[PDB]
Structures are given as structure tokens and as C-alpha cells.
């Protein structure tokens, strides 16, 4: 974990769970908005993607 970085990018491969576990800022993002915790997509990508 300490030598790792999450990058949810595609329409798939965008688990909120794994990226939240890997970096605490994503955990704050998810815990602020519980509804976004969805696996069906629509978990907001970074604006670039």
C-alpha cells in the first residue's frame, strides 16, 4: 500500500472501494457523498478522463 497509487480512469475498472482504500482523500470524497459509492459506473472520474 505505501508504494502504490490508484488511477480509476476507464468506463470500467473504477471501483470506489479500492481507490478509496488506496488513498485517504478518495475515502474522504466517498464518506462525504455516500451515494457515489456505486460499482455500476457514474462514480465521478477525474475531469481529464
Amino acid at each position: 500500500i505505501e508504494y502504490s497509487l490508484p488511477v480509476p480512469f476507464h468506463r470500467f475498472y473504477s471501483n470506489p472501494t479500492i481507490c478509496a482504500a488506496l488513498s485517504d482523500d478518495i475515502k474522504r470524497y466517498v464518506t462525504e457523498f455516500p451515494h457515489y459509492h456505486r460499482h455500476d459506473g457514474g462514480f465521478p472520474l477525474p475531469t481529464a478522463f
Binding site: 497509487l5 480509476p8 481507490c19 488513498s23 478518495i26 474522504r28 457514474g42 477525474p46 475531469t47
Partner: protein, 49 residues
């Protein structure tokens, strides 16, 4: 952009749903009913608007 993902997630703000994703979730026969807002956008079968 690879390492900026937490920097984007630092903002504690949601994002509006994309028009295609908002169009998606209507049930098979409910899509035609006037309660569906997105209908004015579904113009063409080959191309999206």
C-alpha cells in the same frame, strides 16, 4: 495527470450527471412517458446529441 488524481479528489464537491447517463435509467416502458425530461435530446438513432 497520473499522479493528480488525489488533487482532483481534494475538492469536496459533486458533479452533475451527464445527459446520456441521466437518460439511461428510465425503465423500458417508462421512457416514452412525458415525465422523462431527456426526450427532447434523443433526436437521432445513428448519432447522439
Amino acid at each position: 495527470a497520473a499522479r493528480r488524481i488525489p488533487h482532483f479528489y481534494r475538492v469536496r464537491r459533486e458533479v452533475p450527471r451527464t445527459v446520456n447517463e441521466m437518460k439511461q435509467d428510465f425503465v423500458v416502458t417508462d421512457f416514452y412517458k412525458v415525465g422523462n425530461i431527456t426526450l427532447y435530446t434523443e433526436l437521432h438513432p445513428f448519432f447522439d446529441f
